[PDB]
Amino acid sequence: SLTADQMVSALLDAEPPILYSSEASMMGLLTNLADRELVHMINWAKRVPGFVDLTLHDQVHLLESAWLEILMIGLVWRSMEHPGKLLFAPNLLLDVEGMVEIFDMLLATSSRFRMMNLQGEEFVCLKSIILLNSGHIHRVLDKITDTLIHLMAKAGLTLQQQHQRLAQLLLILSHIRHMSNKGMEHLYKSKNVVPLYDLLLEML
Amino acid sequence: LSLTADQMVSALLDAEPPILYSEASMMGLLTNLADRELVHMINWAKRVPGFVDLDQVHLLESAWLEILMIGLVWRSMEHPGKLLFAPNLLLDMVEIFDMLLATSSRFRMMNLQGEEFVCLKSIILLNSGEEKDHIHRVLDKITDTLIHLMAKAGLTLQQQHQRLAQLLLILSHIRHMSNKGMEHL
Ligand SMILES: CC(F)(F)c1cc(F)ccc1-c1sc2cc(O)ccc2c1Oc1ccc(/C=C/C(=O)O)cc1
Ligand SMILES: CC(F)(F)c1cc(F)ccc1-c1sc2cc(O)ccc2c1Oc1ccc(/C=C/C(=O)O)cc1
Numbered sequence: 001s002l003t004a005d006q007m008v009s010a011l012l013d014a015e016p017p018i019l020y021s022s023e024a025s026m027m028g029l030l031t032n033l034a035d036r037e038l039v040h041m042i043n044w045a046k047r048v049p050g051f052v053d054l055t056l057h058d059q060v061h062l063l064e065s066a067w068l069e070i071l072m073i074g075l076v077w078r079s080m081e082h083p084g085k086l087l088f089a090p091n092l093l094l095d096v097e098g099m100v101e102i103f104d105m106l107l108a109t110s111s112r113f114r115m116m117n118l119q120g121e122e123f124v125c126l127k128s129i130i131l132l133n134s135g136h137i138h139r140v141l142d143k144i145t146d147t148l149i150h151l152m153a154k155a156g157l158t159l160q161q162q163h164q165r166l167a168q169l170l171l172i173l174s175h176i177r178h179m180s181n182k183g184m185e186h187l188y189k190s191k192n193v194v195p196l197y198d199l200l201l202e203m204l
Numbered sequence: 205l206s207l208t209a210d211q212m213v214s215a216l217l218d219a220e221p222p223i224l225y226s227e228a229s230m231m232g233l234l235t236n237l238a239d240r241e242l243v244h245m246i247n248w249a250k251r252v253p254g255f256v257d258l259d260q261v262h263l264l265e266s267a268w269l270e271i272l273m274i275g276l277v278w279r280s281m282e283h284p285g286k287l288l289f290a291p292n293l294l295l296d297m298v299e300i301f302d303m304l305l306a307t308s309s310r311f312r313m314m315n316l317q318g319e320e321f322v323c324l325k326s327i328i329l330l331n332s333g334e335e336k337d338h339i340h341r342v343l344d345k346i347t348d349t350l351i352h353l354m355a356k357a358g359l360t361l362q363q364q365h366q367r368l369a370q371l372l373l374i375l376s377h378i379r380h381m382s383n384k385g386m387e388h389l
Binding site: 133 | 383
């Protein structure tokens with residue numbers, strides 16, 4: 001029911017904080033950083049319009065299917081004004097076997113956003129898209145498109161420039177889904193970061 | 205890049221490969237089918253306005269299973285519960301099979317037109333990966349094509365953007381389907 005300006009302001013208020021923090025040392029840091037970031041992500045997801053109307057079962061499913069893409073799109077957004085480096089935290093700016101191909105993708109994605117001049121208002125829309133897309137849900141997904149296109153028209157882009165930019169923005173998401181799949185394959189061995197159902201249920 | 209929307213949709217519709225035919229028996233039949241489908245794909249790709257002007261090898265290395273999946277998902281559309289691999293090969297790993305039925309159900313639920321299906325395939329192929337901007341400008345042209353095809357259909361500007369968004373968010377699903385399809389292979 002929210003207006004496109006009311007929506008973008010709710011997403012901007014929903015925004016999580018920026019957190020702080022050898023192969024095993026670096027991994028112990030990344031594992032711990034994401035763990036604490038997961039708790040702030042569950043609070044954020046409930047601040048996203050429409051997600052809290054959903055049954056706990058649906059909320060779980062979406063988060064389990066999107067917790068790494070959400071972490072990565074947040075990462076790629078922070079790291080953006082730091083070319084050649086990945087700002088996992090303000091005290092954790094980096095540049096481990098197998099992890100090299102994934103790091104290089106996350107660098108390329110960050111480099112794409114910057115060249116494309118990604119804005120914070122479009123970013124909060126995209127991260128909200130990923131949460132709701134991972135799995136009424138299509139009614140909300142339509143509302144975030146209307147918000148993105150409203151922000152493109154408010155910025156002065158022509159109707160052509162609007163649908164062209166929307167598409168480029170929605171295709172970089174195929175890459176984020178890919179970066180997530182390869183990451184899930186790499187990390188898993190066992191899991192040290194608490195399954196999100198235990199967390200979501202623990203928080204209510 | 206000089207090409208119009210109707211010139212782009214018809215150029216791709218012309219490039220459309222033919223429909224082909226057919227446990228160890230099922231996988232062997234599928235390996236053989238796919239192996240014959242890659243030769244038609246490799247040739248279709250050369251007919252994608254922009255693609256032959258390249259790097260082409262890696263784009264088919266990334267999109268070969270996404271293209272095989274979108275094709276399968278497009279064929280099997282009026283066959284709910286079953287997957288139409290070939291007219292003589294209709295089957296009804298289970299995870300990948302279910303993920304493929306859901307996509308086809310979404311394709312049915314959206315009334316996805318063939319003219320829009322060719323555009324998705326060409327976007328899949330190009331977005332799978334001065335020479336780098338060539339891919340960008342072509343994708344921005346397939347998007348004008350998709351929006352024009354919608355304009356013709358009678359949809360409003362708001363009903364156009366939503367539908368563009370709807371179809372594009374399905375490519376994240378087919379990227380995911382391919383990735384988990386690769387692990388299984
Ligand atoms: C290259 C790389 F580091 F980005 C990268 C490469 C991969 F293969 C996979 C993930 C990544 C990322 S993106 C990211 C964003 C952030 O805000 C914070 C942490 C991380 C993180 O690292 C992680 C993420 C999760 C875990 C969990 C382990 C467990 O359950 O035991 C460990 C390390
Ligand atoms: C369930 C399933 F069959 F869909 C499926 C599950 C997966 F995990 C991965 C892919 C699939 C698909 S999608 C498809 C579409 C088509 O038009 C035709 C064949 C196939 C095919 O099967 C394949 C694809 C490639 C190979 C290669 C083997 C080799 O190099 O030895 C074997 C079987």
